[PDB]
Every structure is written in C-alpha cells, then in structure tokens.
Amino acid sequence: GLILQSISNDVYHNLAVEDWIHDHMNLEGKPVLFLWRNSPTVVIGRHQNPWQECNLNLMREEGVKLARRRSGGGTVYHDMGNINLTFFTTKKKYDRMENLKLVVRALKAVHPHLDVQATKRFDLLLDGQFKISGTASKIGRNAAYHHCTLLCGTDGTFLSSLLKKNLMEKDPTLTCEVVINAVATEYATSHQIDNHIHLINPTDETVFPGINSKAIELQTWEWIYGKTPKFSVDTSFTVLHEQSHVEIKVFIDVKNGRIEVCNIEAPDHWLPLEICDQLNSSLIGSKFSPIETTVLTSILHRTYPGDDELHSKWNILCEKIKGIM
C-alpha cells in the first residue's frame, strides 16, 4: 500500500503528478492513493468544451483558473474546500465502487450514521438531495486510475455561477484535513499499511523525474483549449433600429480552437459589407476567444475616417460578438 498527499494547490502540478504515477510506479500488488486540494480552478473532462461550461469572462475577472485533465468525465469546480482522491491501481484490479464505498466508511467514521451513499451514476447523495462527489477515470493497458472529488467546504453558490450544497455546511468539524485523514485511515486499513500519509511537493522533480515539463504542457492553450473537438455556431441577434430591428447573423466553425469558417453577416445599409469582411477575414484562422478591442477598433478607426455613428454601430456589433467569444 501507499498514500500520498500534496502541499501544493496548483492544479496543473497536482495533475502532472497524476500521470507521472500512471505512466510510472508499478501498481501491481502495489496500489496507490493520492489526495490533493487545489486553488479555485475549473476542470473539464478530456473531450469537453471550455466555452460551453464556464463563464470564462466571469472566471477571468476572478483569478479562477481553467484546466483540462487527461481523464474523461464532466466538469466540476475545485477550490480549497474540495478534496481530490485518485485511486491508482492495476487495470486488472480497478473498482470504482470499492472506492466509493471506501469513502463512505471514511465519512461515517467521522459522522456516525450520516445519510450518505453511493448511487447509480457513481456520485454521492447527501440526504438524497445534495450531491457532493464527482467521478472520473482513465484506463491504460496495464493500469487504471479512478479519480474523484469530494465537497467539504467548496462554495456551491460561487460555483453555481459557472454552469453554462456543502459538507461542513452540515457539520463544521468536517474540515477537509479531518476528512483527508478519515479517508487515508480507511485506505490504510483496507490494505493494512502504516496509516502514514507521504506528503509531497509536485514541483520537486528530484522525486519526480522531469515533471514540470508536463505541468507546463497541461497549461498550454494548445492543450487546455486547443483540444476541444470540432464545434460550430449558428446564431443571431437583433439590434434596435429604427425603431424597426436590424438583424445580425453569425456562423463560426471551430477546429482545434482555431476558427475555420467565419461568416458574420450584417445588412449593408446598416454597416458596410467590406467591414464584415475585414472582420470575418481577420478572424479566420484566429484563435477562438475575446478579440483585442484595440485591434478591434484599429480595423477601421484608421481605415474609415471618423463617422461617430459608424464607430457606434461598430461597437454594438463587437459587443454582441465578444458576448460569445
């Protein structure tokens, strides 16, 4: 048996460790539990769409990081009140359930007869209502690791905000540290080995042969965003005018975070078509994200003299545009 914890709260590092172990240490009759809490950070499954899950703009103003993990699964929000547990083992001995049950024991060993249990969809219902735990997995040819999160003190409301109830909020002394032990304890017993948690720092590559490489990688926009499977936009929105309404059309095709086909259409009478070209064009092959509003208005504020009504109608466009970038 073996139990490791991380002093760090830098998701990317705490993630790199994950692989390391999976790409390295032999879990053959040598299972490994790894526990680790991260700073506020939104994490998406391997093949998920960042722009779909979170209010990146909101996240942005918020010191809140985004990250994409090598394991499949859906999106959960991490913070200092969120306990991550990864059960590394041989592919031969992989048992999501065994793990969830393990956690329930851990849990009850700290709140005698607490209304928590496993489900069909491998999460954990507290009181049949509030959910408090998420699942994830990753399967190699010989070994497999079942990742999983626990909600001790994370804020559901501040979370709620990033979509498109807690533990301590039930029992104050359910401090993660407490739950971290309770778990480790239970895992100790379950294989019978020094109830000792081997603390670690994720950056220290004397212990971890060349890790920060991976850590940088999982951080590259190319990887975080650039992996998002092909996805398109087929929308519209109307601006007042006058006082009819002038409609706009937007149709973008994205492939690997890069725009592949951008067709932004507006009525020539309201706004010169050779502008919507300028945009569409300076946007093809560009990365899908907010647009530098200096290059933005640069486009024309130098090109087309000074029509305040022009500039004004230009914004209202960029506006609606950036509102979905």
UniProtKB/Swiss-Prot annotation:
Disulfide bridges in this chain: none
Catalytic activity reported: N(6)-[(R)-lipoyl]-L-lysyl-[glycine-cleavage complex H protein] + L-lysyl-[lipoyl-carrier protein] = L-lysyl-[glycine-cleavage complex H protein] + N(6)-[(R)-lipoyl]-L-lysyl-[lipoyl-carrier protein]; (R)-lipoyl-5'-AMP + L-lysyl-[lipoyl-carrier protein] = N(6)-[(R)-lipoyl]-L-lysyl-[lipoyl-carrier protein] + AMP + 2 H(+)
Entry keyword Transit peptide: yes
InterPro entries attached to this UniProt entry: aa-tRNA-synth_II/BPL/LPL (IPR045864), BPL_LPL_catalytic (IPR004143), LipoylTrfase_LipoateP_Ligase (IPR004562)
EC number assigned by the record: 2.3.1.200, 2.3.1.-
Mitochondrion keyword on record: yes
Record entry for activity regulation: Inhibited by lipoyl-AMP analogs including hexanoyl-, octanoyl- and decanoyl-AMP.
Subcellular location: Mitochondrion
Purpose: Lipoyl amidotransferase that catalyzes the transfer of lipoyl moieties from lipoyl-protein H of the glycine cleavage system (lipoyl-GCSH) to E2 subunits of the pyruvate dehydrogenase complex (PDCE2). Unable to catalyze the transfer of octanoyl from octanoyl-GCSH to PDCE2. In vitro, it is also able to catalyze the transfer of the lipoyl group from lipoyl-AMP to the specific lysine residue of lipoyl domains of lipoate-dependent enzymes but this reaction may not be physiologically relevant.
Name of this protein: Lipoyl amidotransferase LIPT1, mitochondrial
Organism: Bos taurus (Bovine)
